[PDB]
Write an enzyme that holds these catalytic residues in place. Structure first.
Site, short mmCIF file in Angstrom:
data_model
loop_
_atom_site.label_atom_id
_atom_site.label_comp_id
_atom_site.label_asym_id
_atom_site.label_seq_id
_atom_site.Cartn_x
_atom_site.Cartn_y
_atom_site.Cartn_z
N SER B 61 0.82 -1.19 0.00
CA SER B 61 0.00 0.00 0.00
C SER B 61 0.87 1.26 0.00
O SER B 61 0.97 1.92 1.03
CB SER B 61 -0.88 -0.02 1.25
OG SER B 61 -1.88 0.99 1.20
N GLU B 63 1.11 3.32 -3.24
CA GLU B 63 0.62 4.21 -4.30
C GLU B 63 -0.81 4.58 -3.90
O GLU B 63 -1.10 5.70 -3.46
CB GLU B 63 0.65 3.50 -5.67
CG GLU B 63 0.34 4.44 -6.85
CD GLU B 63 0.21 3.74 -8.21
OE1 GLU B 63 0.86 2.69 -8.47
OE2 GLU B 63 -0.54 4.28 -9.05
N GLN B 76 -2.41 -16.13 -0.13
CA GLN B 76 -1.51 -17.23 -0.36
C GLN B 76 -0.22 -16.87 -1.05
O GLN B 76 -0.01 -15.71 -1.39
CB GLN B 76 -2.24 -18.36 -1.08
CG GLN B 76 -3.59 -18.68 -0.43
CD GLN B 76 -4.23 -19.97 -0.93
OE1 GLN B 76 -3.65 -20.72 -1.75
NE2 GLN B 76 -5.43 -20.25 -0.42
N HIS B 82 -2.07 -4.36 -4.70
CA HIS B 82 -1.53 -3.04 -4.99
C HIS B 82 -2.69 -2.22 -5.53
O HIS B 82 -3.70 -2.78 -5.91
CB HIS B 82 -0.41 -3.14 -6.02
CG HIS B 82 0.43 -1.91 -6.09
ND1 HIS B 82 0.61 -1.24 -7.28
CD2 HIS B 82 1.07 -1.26 -5.10
CE1 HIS B 82 1.36 -0.20 -6.97
NE2 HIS B 82 1.66 -0.17 -5.67
N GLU B 85 -2.92 5.19 -7.63
CA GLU B 85 -2.87 6.42 -6.84
C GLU B 85 -4.25 6.93 -6.43
O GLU B 85 -5.05 7.33 -7.27
CB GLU B 85 -2.12 7.50 -7.62
CG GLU B 85 -1.63 8.67 -6.77
CD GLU B 85 -0.84 9.70 -7.56
OE1 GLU B 85 -0.33 9.36 -8.65
OE2 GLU B 85 -0.71 10.84 -7.09
N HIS B 118 -3.05 -19.16 -4.40
CA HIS B 118 -1.70 -19.10 -4.93
C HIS B 118 -1.61 -18.36 -6.21
O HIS B 118 -2.30 -18.67 -7.16
CB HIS B 118 -1.17 -20.49 -5.19
CG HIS B 118 -1.39 -21.44 -4.07
ND1 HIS B 118 -0.54 -21.57 -2.99
CD2 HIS B 118 -2.36 -22.37 -3.87
CE1 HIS B 118 -1.01 -22.54 -2.20
NE2 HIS B 118 -2.12 -23.08 -2.68
N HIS B 123 -5.82 -5.88 -7.77
CA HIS B 123 -5.30 -4.54 -7.91
C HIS B 123 -6.37 -3.46 -7.82
O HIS B 123 -7.38 -3.51 -8.49
CB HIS B 123 -4.56 -4.46 -9.24
CG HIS B 123 -3.61 -3.31 -9.32
ND1 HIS B 123 -4.01 -1.99 -9.34
CD2 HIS B 123 -2.26 -3.29 -9.32
CE1 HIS B 123 -2.90 -1.23 -9.34
NE2 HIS B 123 -1.80 -1.97 -9.33
N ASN B 203 -6.41 -22.64 6.29
CA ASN B 203 -5.60 -21.47 6.51
C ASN B 203 -5.72 -20.88 7.88
O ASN B 203 -4.72 -20.50 8.47
CB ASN B 203 -5.85 -20.44 5.41
CG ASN B 203 -5.12 -20.80 4.12
OD1 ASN B 203 -3.98 -20.40 3.90
ND2 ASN B 203 -5.74 -21.66 3.33
#
Ligand SMILES: [Zn+2]
Ligand SMILES: [Zn+2]
Ligand SMILES: [Zn+2]
Lengths: 213, 213, 213
Positions: B61, B63, B76, B82, B85, B118, B123, B203
């Protein structure tokens, strides 16, 4: 009593000795470039000014060498660079796997202002012109991507030559020149027409910013 | 004589200072969460209870901020988060890149009981509802995946809004609302109908188990 | 005064304790194998002679065990191995998730001289015969890839059984036996007909070479 010695860059190693590589070389990295501690740069590599190599990236020039990353370009998280054996065990160039840019031979050539987005991969022989955006999860192998192109997320170019100013739509796997030649032109209203400029800007600023902290 | 000082989490760094980020923030990680030593968490991040962040994951974290990973979810191996902006250099929100969930703005929002299998990648701008399974190698960008959905291995959603309870077949790259709207419904006999519950269970147990050792 | 103790392989950890795994196991790695410092090997794993595990690879046997990587094979950058729970919390085998090779059960079985190229992923249950080339970014899940096959970059086999000597063209996501059965035969003039031999050679030499340096 103990005395500890620390290497701050064990991730920026050098080439191993193999039948095709008798004398190890090490990454040549411009001072302004930022190589994330969790990235990995090995062998004959040349990174230019302001390059931002993100976490988990792996630039590995040990089979086919060299790998070149131009100025202001960026290697995002997960990106991988690698190439096919450029020299055989007799010191004979394996022409098929060498690409030429301005009279210089390379196993992989990434120009200036080039974006290798998250998870993309570029494998030699390959060349990617300036101002091109290699989108998330894209793949380029045995190809030559021109300038100002745009491979949208998931596109792939294999054994073809993308002309300048083209773009490969998301998910499209191009593998024939016929197809490559018919690719769409990047126009001012194309959605990704300006994505590179932005990404480049951000990354260039991320490089220096990460350099203090 | 020497005195050595150790940071056990140099992989859980903070934000760098950029024209859009003047004051560094650091990951807020619930105590029950397990961040693998070879994972990388950077910047304005919020990980919840029992999250299991596996090796080579990269939650970044820096942008577009913030990135949120809800309770009982999992990131995973290889997964990347990401965003684009979210603020410009004048402190003006770049509305286009912000997603809203329950009155809160986020660059990337992963709900509770969500599986980022995986190699998947998410984004920003993006939002992924509770109980959804983002399959191996999947990709979600500029989209909004609803609850109880299932993106099978290789599917991709780009700029579309998957309705709740749908699933994207393996390899399908969805890029139009028309298509998104016609997606199949997850039924009790659909093969991945229960895959999430299982993955979540494993998990969650992997998180605590890895916490002793 | 301080005394520092160093573990040279914190990346080659062991299994954690879970409801399905009460007694931790650790990777069994043949001495000739090379596990890159930035790779990650966890749990019940067996790596054979001359295996070359590259950077960012993640072999994680903690859910479904065991994972086996035969002799002379290679796990390239970014590759991920993982499997579905092979045992329930009562010690009962979850038959569906177990694959059998020569009378031995495995969650994931990679034979000898097998190449798991950059970014590929293999997820149990799965089996991949000798001399097969799992191309860059490929995916194999709940399937059984035979000997001497070739999954070109981007191919994927899901819940199908590729017969020996076949190859899946780039970008093709195979998910039905009908399709699998109709796959092309690898012939002497097929482009990737010899790619494996070469990759294997290189990687085997990279293993030892990386062992000095
Ligand atoms: Zn390679
Ligand atoms: Zn990004
Ligand atoms: Zn798994």
């Amino acid at each position: 009593m103990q005395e500890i010695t620390v290497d701050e860059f064990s991730n920026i190693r050098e080439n191993p000795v193999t039948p095709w590589n008798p004398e190890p070389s090490a990454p040549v990295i411009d001072p302004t470039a930022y190589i994330d501690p969790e990235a990995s740069v090995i062998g004959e590599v040349t990174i230019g000014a302001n390059v931002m190599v993100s976490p988990m990236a792996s630039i590995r020039s040990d089979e086919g060498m060299p790998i070149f990353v131009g100025d202001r370009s960026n290697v995002q998280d997960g990106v991988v660079l690698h190439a096919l054996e450029t020299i055989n065990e007799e010191g004979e160039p394996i022409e098929d796997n060498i690409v030429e840019v301005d009279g210089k031979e390379y196993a992989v050539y990434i120009g200036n202002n080039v974006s290798l987005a998250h998870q993309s991969q570029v494998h030699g022989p390959a060349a990617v012109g300036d101002d091109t955006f290699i989108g998330m999860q894209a793949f380029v192998f045995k190809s030559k991507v021109g300038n100002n192109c745009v491979l949208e997320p998931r596109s792939a170019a294999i054994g073809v030559t993308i002309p300048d100013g083209r773009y490969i739509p998301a998910g499209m796997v191009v593998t024939s020149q016929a197809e490559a030649d018919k690719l769409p032109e990047v126009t001012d209203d194309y959605a990704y027409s300006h994505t590179n400029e932005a990404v480049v800007y951000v990354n260039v600023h991320l490089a220096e910013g990460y350099k203090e902290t």
